[PDB]
Design a protein around this ligand. Structure first.
Ligand code: ECJ
Lengths: 51, 50, 228, 50, 50, 100, 217
């Protein structure tokens, strides 16, 4: 039902919980890096420009 | 299972011989219905909406 | 210590275009208020456009109506550009009836007392057949910003009426704003600034009340900074 | 890229620009000179720095 | 013939104009290019790829 | 329609059937969002049967997943058309030009 | 058609002179509409008092040398701009700096007037070399509405009247239940000590409302 309160709960599980990001040809170990997740609207993944 | 049958006797629901297999709208996509077609195998009686 | 401005000449060209002067401004306040007003004007100004339209025969925006050369969502797109200003009503429903080989303009809508049509020449749809009948309910309401039709079917709670064509609503009466800050001379006062805001409307809202409500909003937001 | 253009544009200098030659107490008043339209981003200028 | 079409329209030959940041209201140093570029939407729509 | 074009916009739009091109020249008798009727000129008209060239337009129908293909009439009622004119644009065509 | 007003104005402050005030939620566009128009008042048009003009005892020129001081005359001027003066009921005051000896001359070494308050008595004005070496001068502070350079003076030191030393505003996203995107405004500000940051913001936006007084419906 996507009740409004599950969103506020999702922030709780998300906080100190890193996720892994991987881009297509994984050449060196940097092709998988762990980031802390930021809840964003829309269907796109937001990537830090320096990484 | 035992426990599920105990659940059947408490709230008294006639356990179905049938399983839900309806065509449902894929999650995330949304729009308007603009056509329905029904092709019925020859010999089956064409249903109401058909 | 600080000189405060007022609105002087408000020169109006077309019903859609206007040029508003703000005359007793200090150095730096021409641009400080000019942008922060352009920012308010374009984004958060009350106005009204059409929210929902019921068409007689049509079941949905992807149909055809015998006797009309416009597709239904082309007719819905014509209504999105219907410029109505309504008086003491928050939502009003209009009724459009016209038949014959004539283009159906916005003057062909039944006129309510509280309702004013800005563009009577505005084209809603054309009629090709002789006796080609069309009749519709168009539901206008006042609103702010840009409300899509997608976000309207969350509350819903039985909007089942299968023939109620929901349309996107772009309620801002502001189309375009530019502000040019030139020096102002008011007898003695070495250097002051004359702020000219130039703005285009859809005709529904008049320029003076727009600026008044623009700066009214601005004073209210600073209320959370007058204290903490 | 987008960023190194920015810093290269900052840490640049042109021959005769708004602010050419004034002396500023610290970096803070140097940003104050730029955001107020008084000093140009690239003008030779002595500033007290620590 | 391109610069000459711009003159006929009362537009600058450089095809660049002075632009203003709608956020702070302040002008942009240097003239940026503005003009009309035909742009497509390719069917890699994200709500398919996600 | 591209303001910046190259000229081929017509040749690509016309030759693929996504549009609706005039069989024979004449005047429009009736223009619906559905169909279009062209009263044929006598010189282009065949002796028996007489007749009028009638083009039924494609309306909102499914493509090879998942996109749509829908045609729109681009002539107004009682307008002269000649052989090879565009009676109805299709998807990504405006007035007979490739508008992708 | 009533508008959104912010809540929870949490005020995380580093020192009395520095502060960072976060205030959410704003309607969309209001981060920059309020953030910018407030930075513009703070930076450019803010009442204050700093050092405007100084007459020097030993020399009449800014491009000279003073016997007994290791700072160049124009280096002492940078110290004067960074003298944080708050004056009470006086519109023009003149101070006296009487001091000699092998000591650095601080702002506590200025005569303490009734209407004059020095924010940094520890503040360093200039240094004194060997022997006694005599130095004493009268320094005149002036009121202003912003930052007036000496270049714009036609009838000299730069005058930083605005108590702001630096202002920046950062706009980040805010979430309010079912309200996808709003604006959370982060204001960070440095003062010269005369007015503290919290009251500076209050007086900054009051000025803005006064300009709008002829428009509020
Ligand atoms: N680890 C990855 N990192 C970045 N991109 C990836 C990764 N894996 C798949 N893609 C993209 O996903 C499809 C292919 O997926 P798959 O190979 O068929 O496998 P599975 O069916 O199981 O998803 C392509 O993208 P596209 O179809 O848009 O076309 P493209 O290759 O030119 O980018 C791939 O780039």
């Amino acid at each position: 039902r996507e009740e409004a309160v599950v969103w506020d709960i999702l922030d709780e599980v998300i906080r100190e919980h890193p996720v892994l990001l991987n881009r297509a040809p994984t050449l060196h170990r940097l092709g998988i890096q762990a980031f802390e997740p930021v809840l964003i609207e829309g269907k796109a993944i937001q990537l830090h420009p320096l990484v | 299972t035992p426990e599920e049958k105990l659940l059947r006797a408490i709230f008294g629901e006639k356990a179905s011989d049938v399983k839900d297999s309806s065509l449902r709208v894929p999650n995330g996509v949304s729009g308007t219905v603009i056509d329905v077609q029904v092709f019925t195998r020859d010999g089956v009686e064409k249903d109401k909406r058909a | 210590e600080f000189l405060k401005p007022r609105l002087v000449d408000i020169e109006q060209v077309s019903s859609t275009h206007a040029k508003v002067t703000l005359e007793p401004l200090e150095r730096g306040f021409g641009h400080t208020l000019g942008n922060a007003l352009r920012r308010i004007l374009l984004s958060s100004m009350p106005g009204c456009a059409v929210t929902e339209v019921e068409i007689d025969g049509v079941l949905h925006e992807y149909s055809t109506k015998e006797g009309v050369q416009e597709d239904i969502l082309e007719i819905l797109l014509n209504l999105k550009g219907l410029a109505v200003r309504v008086q003491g009503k928050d939502e009003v429903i209009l009724t459009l009836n016209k038949s014959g080989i004539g283009p159906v303009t916005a003057a062909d809508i039944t006129h309510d007392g509280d309702v004013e049509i800005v563009k009577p020449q505005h084209v809603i749809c054309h009629l090709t057949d002789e006796n080609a009948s069309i009749s519709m309910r168009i539901k206008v309401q006042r609103g702010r910003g840009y409300v899509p039709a997608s976000t309207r079917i969350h509350s819903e709670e039985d909007e089942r009426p299968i023939g109620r064509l929901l349309v996107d609503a772009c309620y801002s009466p502001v189309e375009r704003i530019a502000y040019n800050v030139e020096a102002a001379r008011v007898e003695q006062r070495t250097d002051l600034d004359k702020l000219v805001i130039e703005m285009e409307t859809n005709g529904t809202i008049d320029p003076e009340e727009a600026i008044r409500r623009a700066a009214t909003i601005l004073a209210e937001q600073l209320e959370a900074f007058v204290d903490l | 890229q987008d960023v190194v253009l920015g810093l290269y544009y900052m840490t640049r200098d042109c021959v005769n620009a708004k602010g050419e030659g004034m002396v500023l107490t610290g970096p803070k008043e140097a940003e104050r000179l730029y955001r107020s339209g008084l000093a140009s981003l690239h003008a030779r200028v002595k500033v007290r720095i620590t | 013939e391109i610069k000459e079409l711009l003159k006929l329209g009362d537009l600058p030959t450089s095809g660049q104009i002075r632009l203003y940041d709608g956020r702070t209201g302040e002008q942009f140093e240097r003239p940026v290019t503005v003009g009309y570029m035909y742009m497509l939407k390719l069917n890699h729509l994200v709500d398919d790829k996600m | 329609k591209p303001l910046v074009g190259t000229g081929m916009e017509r040749a690509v739009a016309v030759d693929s059937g996504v549009t609706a091109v005039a069989k024979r020249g004449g005047v429009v008798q009736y223009v619906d969002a559905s169909r279009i009727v062209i009263k044929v000129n006598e010189d282009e008209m065949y002796p028996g049967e007489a007749g009028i060239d009638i083009y039924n337009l494609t309306k909102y129908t499914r493509s090879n997943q998942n996109t749509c293909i829908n045609q729109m009439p681009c002539v107004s009622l009682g307008e002269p058309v000649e052989r090879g004119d565009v009676l109805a644009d299709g998807p990504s065509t405006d007035l007979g030009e490739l508008a992708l």
